[PDB]
Amino acid sequence: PVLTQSPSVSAAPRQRVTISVSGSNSNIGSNTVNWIQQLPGRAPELLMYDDDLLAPGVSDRFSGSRSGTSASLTISGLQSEDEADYYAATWDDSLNGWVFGGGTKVTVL
Amino acid sequence: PVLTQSPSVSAAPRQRVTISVSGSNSNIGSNTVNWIQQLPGRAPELLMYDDDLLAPGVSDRFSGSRSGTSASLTISGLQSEDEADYYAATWDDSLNGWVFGGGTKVTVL
Amino acid sequence: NKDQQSAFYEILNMPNLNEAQRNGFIQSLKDDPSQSTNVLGEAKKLNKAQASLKSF
Amino acid sequence: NKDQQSAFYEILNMPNLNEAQRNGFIQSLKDDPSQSTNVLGEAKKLNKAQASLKSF
């Protein structure tokens, strides 16, 4: 994975959790970031796109932002169904292709 | 049961299902509605309260509403884990006490 | 803070909440103390709603 | 509503959207057609983003 994400975390229901990612000028510094959620055993799906836009049907407990070569996804009011792996995805101008973070697991206690 | 609930319903995963309840001016017409979920074999627990507030740890796939003498609970993105009996509960000013619906079973196909 | 500290203790003393509900409200209080009133309000309402289970 | 009709067909032809996303955007168009431009923009962006899922 070209992008470095914050390590997996355990958190309680209703906690606020922020997953962050950092890259370089050729990806996050010049391209918008998307956030992919991978639920256990399910196909991965887009939660957020264009830095801060919610995919249709996604809860507004999710919020996104980008600054410089870093970006983050914040989950407010954490809930058991949010237990998942979260991946940043962005375009990389040097690779001329998609690059991804290694993933961050959120475990809901 | 003082409150009348919509008949039990079967639905496929990913569908949106709405459970409804109706009462009178002395209960739903002047008091907020709570929604109790009883999963098979488990103690009943509060899912929603004050018409539209989620208990901690409850998924926001559930949403609630009240209008006049009726109220409803909506399950978006129906999941097999939602298969349960759902009961409305509200205060009754004439009985000066709690009144309940008969229950609505949601079966997930 | 006098008002926020008070909310913590009032939530802890609500007799009908179960421990998961109490802990969730407390987590919300820690995440944003400026929401104390709102959090307290929700806890009070859920405390009231929890009484219906005793009649259920 | 020729411009909105055009946005409708352009959303329907976006190859990477799934049916829930497409139906959500179209529902937004029907709810308030005056937002068509904004909705179209979002759909285009989401279509591009959906391509990342195929590389993932």
Ramachandran bin of B41, using left for φ above 0, alpha for ψ from -120 to 50, beta for the remaining angles: left
Q: Mutate which of B98, B99, B100 to disrupt the C interface (most C C-beta within 10 Å)?
A: B98
| Dist CA A48 CA A36 (whole Å) | 7
Smallest CA–CA separation between B102 and chain A, in Å? 29
- Chain D residues inside the 8 Å CB shell of A34: 49, 52
B61 shares contact with chain A (CB less than 8 Å): yes
- Chain C residues inside the 8 Å CB shell of A77: 28
Residue of chain A whose alpha carbon sits nearest to that of C26: A14
| Antiparallel, parallel or unpaired: β B17-22 and B70-75 | antiparallel
| Dist CA B42 CA B40 (whole Å) | 6
B41 shares contact with chain A (CB less than 8 Å): no
| Dist CA A47 CA A35 (whole Å) | 6
| Dist CA A82 CA B58 (whole Å) | 11
Smallest CA–CA separation between A21 and chain C, in Å? 22
Interface of A with C in 10-29 (CB under 8 A): 12-16
The CB density around residue C24, as the number of other CB atoms within 10 Å, is 29
Written as six digits, the tokens of B47 are 């899912």
Which of B57, B76, B77 lies at the smallest CB-CB distance from A80? B57
| Dist CA A29 CA A93 (whole Å) | 10
Written as six digits, the tokens of D9 are 């067909």
- Residue pairs between chains B and C whose CB atoms are closer than 8 Å: 50
| Dist CA B100 CA B1 (whole Å) | 6
| Dist CA A98 CA A2 (whole Å) | 10
Interface of B with C in 27-46 (CB under 8 A): 32, 34, 36, 44-46
- Chain D residues inside the 8 Å CB shell of A36: 52-53, 56
Integer distance in angstroms from the first to the last C-alpha of chain A? 28
Q: Which of B57, D8, C39, B71 is nearest to A82 (CA)?
A: B57
| Dist CA C30 CA C16 (whole Å) | 21
Strand segments, DSSP code E, in D1-56 are none
Domains (range + CATH), chain C: 1-56 (1.20.5.420)
Residue of chain A whose alpha carbon sits nearest to that of B79: A81
Cα four-point dihedral sign A34, A85, B55, C32: negative
Q: Do residue D53 and residue A49 have CB atoms under 8 angstroms apart?
A: no
| DSSP per position, chain C | -HHHHHHHHHHHT-TT--HHHHHHHHHHHHH-GGGHHHHHHHHHHHHHHHTHHHH-
Q: Which residues contact D31 (CB under 8 A, 6 or more apart)?
A: none
Q: Do residue A79 and residue B60 have CB atoms under 8 angstroms apart?
A: yes
Gyration radius from chain B CA atoms: 13
Q: Which of A40, A52, A59, A61 is nearest to A103 (CA)?
A: A40
Gyration radius from chain D CA atoms: 11
| Dist CA B106 CA B103 (whole Å) | 10
Half-sphere exposure of A69 (CA within 13 A, CB side): 10
Written as six digits, the tokens of A51 are 């830095």
Which of D21, D23, D51 lies at the smallest CB-CB distance from A55? D21
Reduce the DSSP state of residue A29 to 3 states and report it.
coil
Q: Which residues contact B71 (CB under 8 A, 6 or more apart)?
A: B20, B21, B28, B33, B51, B64, B65, B88, B90
| Dist CA B21 CA B36 (whole Å) | 13
Half-sphere exposure of C51 (CA within 13 A, CB side): 13
The CB density around residue A25, as the number of other CB atoms within 10 Å, is 12
Q: Quick one: three-class SS letters along chain B?
A: CCEEECCCEEECCCCCEEEEEECCCCCCCCCCEEEEEECCCCCCEEEEECCCEECCCCCCCEEEEEECCEEEEEECCCCHHHCEEEEEEEEECCCCEEEEECCEEEEEC
What are the backbone angles phi and psi of residue A11, rounded to the nearest 5°?
-150, 155
A58 shares contact with chain D (CB less than 8 Å): no
